[PDB]
Design an enzyme around this catalytic site. Structure first.
Site, PDB file in Angstrom:
ATOM      1  N   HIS A   1      -5.272 -58.220 -49.921  1.00  0.00           N
ATOM      2  CA  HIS A   1      -3.742 -57.728 -49.220  1.00  0.00           C
ATOM      3  C   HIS A   1      -3.912 -57.899 -47.803  1.00  0.00           C
ATOM      4  O   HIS A   1      -3.055 -58.035 -47.229  1.00  0.00           O
ATOM      5  CB  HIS A   1      -3.462 -56.528 -49.913  1.00  0.00           C
TER       6      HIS A   1
ATOM      7  N   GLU B   1     -17.508 -55.854 -32.247  1.00  0.00           N
ATOM      8  CA  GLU B   1     -16.491 -55.241 -31.422  1.00  0.00           C
ATOM      9  C   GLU B   1     -16.916 -53.556 -31.374  1.00  0.00           C
ATOM     10  O   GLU B   1     -17.195 -53.199 -32.295  1.00  0.00           O
ATOM     11  CB  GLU B   1     -15.142 -55.457 -31.700  1.00  0.00           C
TER      12      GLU B   1
ATOM     13  N   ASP C   1      -8.714 -56.323 -55.387  1.00  0.00           N
ATOM     14  CA  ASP C   1      -8.288 -56.407 -54.036  1.00  0.00           C
ATOM     15  C   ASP C   1      -9.384 -56.785 -53.469  1.00  0.00           C
ATOM     16  O   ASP C   1     -10.084 -55.931 -52.682  1.00  0.00           O
ATOM     17  CB  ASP C   1      -7.629 -54.934 -53.701  1.00  0.00           C
TER      18      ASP C   1
ATOM     19  N   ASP D   1      -9.350 -39.219 -43.944  1.00  0.00           N
ATOM     20  CA  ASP D   1      -9.115 -40.323 -45.037  1.00  0.00           C
ATOM     21  C   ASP D   1      -9.214 -41.640 -44.043  1.00  0.00           C
ATOM     22  O   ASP D   1      -9.188 -41.687 -42.980  1.00  0.00           O
ATOM     23  CB  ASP D   1      -7.776 -39.892 -45.435  1.00  0.00           C
TER      24      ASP D   1
ATOM     25  N   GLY E   1      -4.573 -50.438 -41.207  1.00  0.00           N
ATOM     26  CA  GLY E   1      -5.535 -50.837 -40.168  1.00  0.00           C
ATOM     27  C   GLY E   1      -6.866 -50.655 -40.710  1.00  0.00           C
ATOM     28  O   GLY E   1      -7.514 -51.527 -40.019  1.00  0.00           O
TER      29      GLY E   1
ATOM     30  N   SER F   1      -7.929 -51.029 -44.085  1.00  0.00           N
ATOM     31  CA  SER F   1      -8.054 -51.862 -45.182  1.00  0.00           C
ATOM     32  C   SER F   1      -8.823 -53.093 -45.214  1.00  0.00           C
ATOM     33  O   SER F   1      -8.736 -53.600 -43.992  1.00  0.00           O
ATOM     34  CB  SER F   1      -6.651 -52.637 -45.366  1.00  0.00           C
ATOM     35  N   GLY F   2      -9.699 -53.483 -45.866  1.00  0.00           N
ATOM     36  CA  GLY F   2     -10.610 -54.689 -45.832  1.00  0.00           C
ATOM     37  C   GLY F   2     -11.843 -54.117 -45.396  1.00  0.00           C
ATOM     38  O   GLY F   2     -12.990 -54.859 -45.545  1.00  0.00           O
TER      39      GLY F   2
HETATM   40  C1  LIG Z   1       2.565 -50.305 -44.797  1.00  0.00           C
HETATM   41  C2  LIG Z   1       0.698 -50.702 -45.258  1.00  0.00           C
HETATM   42  C3  LIG Z   1       0.344 -51.853 -45.316  1.00  0.00           C
HETATM   43  C4  LIG Z   1      -1.076 -52.270 -45.080  1.00  0.00           C
HETATM   44 BR1  LIG Z   1      -1.353 -53.986 -44.967  1.00  0.00          BR
HETATM   45  C5  LIG Z   1      -1.930 -51.534 -45.668  1.00  0.00           C
HETATM   46  O1  LIG Z   1      -3.345 -51.582 -45.954  1.00  0.00           O
HETATM   47  C6  LIG Z   1      -1.580 -49.937 -46.034  1.00  0.00           C
HETATM   48  C7  LIG Z   1      -2.283 -49.056 -46.206  1.00  0.00           C
HETATM   49  C8  LIG Z   1      -2.144 -47.866 -46.591  1.00  0.00           C
HETATM   50  C9  LIG Z   1      -3.252 -47.220 -46.951  1.00  0.00           C
HETATM   51  C10 LIG Z   1      -3.811 -45.663 -47.324  1.00  0.00           C
HETATM   52  C11 LIG Z   1      -5.239 -45.584 -47.291  1.00  0.00           C
HETATM   53  C12 LIG Z   1      -5.403 -44.249 -47.695  1.00  0.00           C
HETATM   54  N1  LIG Z   1      -6.949 -44.055 -48.006  1.00  0.00           N
HETATM   55  N2  LIG Z   1      -4.711 -43.166 -47.693  1.00  0.00           N
HETATM   56  C13 LIG Z   1      -5.981 -46.580 -47.306  1.00  0.00           C
HETATM   57  C14 LIG Z   1      -5.587 -48.143 -46.917  1.00  0.00           C
HETATM   58  C15 LIG Z   1      -4.367 -48.124 -46.602  1.00  0.00           C
HETATM   59  N3  LIG Z   1      -3.750 -49.064 -46.518  1.00  0.00           N
HETATM   60  C16 LIG Z   1      -0.055 -49.819 -45.561  1.00  0.00           C
HETATM   61 CA   LIG Z   2     -14.107 -55.565 -27.191  1.00  0.00          CA
END
Ligand SMILES: Cc1cc(Br)c([O-])c(-c2cc3cc(C(N)=[NH2+])ccc3[nH]2)c1
Ligand SMILES: [Ca+2]
Ligand SMILES: [Cl-]
Length: 223
Positions: A40, A52, A84, A171, A175, A177-178
Site C-alpha cells: 500500500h 537517515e 501487503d 503503537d 508514516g 507503514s512499510g
Molecule cells: C490514512 C492512512 C494512510 C496510510 Br498510506 C496509512 O499507512 C495509514 C495507516 C494507519 C495505520 C495505523 C497503524 C497502527 N498500528 N494502528 C499502522 C499503520 C497505519 N497506517 C493511514
Molecule cells: Ca538526514
C-alpha cells in the site's frame, strides 16, 4: 510511532525512508540492492533514503538512491490489505557498513510473546498529527492469534499478526507503514494497518514475513 522513544542516530541501520519530495513510508534493507516495504506504500517516483536519522537535515551517512522497479505482491488486495508486501530494487547498490546494513529474513515464524522493535518516522499522536524529524522506536510483543482475531473479528488472514499493547498508548501509526518489526534479529513483520493509532484494544496489524520468504527469494532471484 506513538509512545515510543528516540532510537539514537543510525542504531537501526536497515531502516529506510521512501521519499517523493517528503517521507511517506518506511522500508527495510534486505541486501545491497533490495528493500522490502508494504504494497500500500506503492507509487512511482520513489527515492529510497538510507542512513537517515533526522529526515529533514543531511547530517552525513545518507545515501539517496532511486528505485529501479517496485514489485507489489500479485495477490495484494487493497480492500483487505492481505499480502501487503512489496519489493523495491535500487538503481545502484548501496554501500553497507555499520550505519547502513541489511536485516536477515526469518527461517521460522515468531511466537506470541516474542518482543520486537518497530521503528519509523510516522505520526507520534493518536489524536492529531505530529511527525518527528528523527527516527522513533518502540519495543512491542507479538500477541496471540485469539487476541488479534478477537480485536479485529473477520479481518485477520493467516498473513497477518498483531503486535502492541491492548491498553493503548504505544503503537505504530501512518508514516510508519512499510517499516520493520524485527525480533531476535530477523525481520518478522512489516507495519501494515490498525484502527486509529494507539487506541485501546486496537493493536497494530503486521504482514507476517515468514510466509513470504520463498516468494521474496524467488522474485529477487528472477529480477
Ligand atoms: C490514512 C492512512 C494512510 C496510510 Br498510506 C496509512 O499507512 C495509514 C495507516 C494507519 C495505520 C495505523 C497503524 C497502527 N498500528 N494502528 C499502522 C499503520 C497505519 N497506517 C493511514
Ligand atoms: Ca538526514
Ligand atoms: Cl474470525
Amino acid at each position: 510511532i506513538v509512545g515510543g522513544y528516540t532510537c539514537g542516530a543510525n542504531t537501526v541501520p536497515y531502516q529506510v525512508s521512501l521519499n517523493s519530495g517528503y517521507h511517506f513510508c518506511g522500508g527495510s534493507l534486505i541486501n545491497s540492492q533490495w528493500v522490502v516495504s508494504a504494497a500500500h506504500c506503492y507509487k512511482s517516483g520513489i527515492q529510497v533514503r538510507l542512513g537517515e536519522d533526522n529526515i529533514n537535515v543531511v547530517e552525513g551517512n545518507e545515501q539517496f538512491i532511486s528505485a529501479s522497479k517496485s514489485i507489489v505482491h500479485p495477490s495484494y488486495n487493497s480492500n483487505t490489505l492481505n499480502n501487503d508486501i512489496m519489493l523495491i530494487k535500487l538503481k545502484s547498490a548501496a554501500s553497507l557498513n555499520s550505519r547502513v546494513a541489511s536485516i536477515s529474513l526469518p527461517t521460522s515464524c515468531a511466537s506470541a510473546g516474542t518482543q520486537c522493535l518497530i521503528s519509523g518516522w510516522g505520526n507520534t499522536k493518536s489524536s492529531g498529527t505530529s511527525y518527528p524529524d528523527v527516527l522513533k522506536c518502540l519495543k512491542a510483543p507479538i500477541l496471540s492469534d485469539s487476541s488479534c482475531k478477537s480485536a479485529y473479528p473477520g479481518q485477520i488472514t493467516s498473513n497477518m499478526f498483531c503486535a502492541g499493547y491492548l491498553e493503548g498508548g504505544k503503537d505504530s501509526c501512518q508514516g510508519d507503514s512499510g517499516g520493520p518489526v524485527v525480533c531476535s534479529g530477523k525481520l518478522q513483520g512489516i507495519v501494515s494497518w490498525g484502527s486509529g493509532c494507539a487506541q485501546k484494544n486496537k493493536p497494530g496489524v503486521y504482514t507476517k514475513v515468514c510466509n513470504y520468504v520463498s516468494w521474496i527469494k524467488q522474485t529477487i532471484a528472477s529480477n
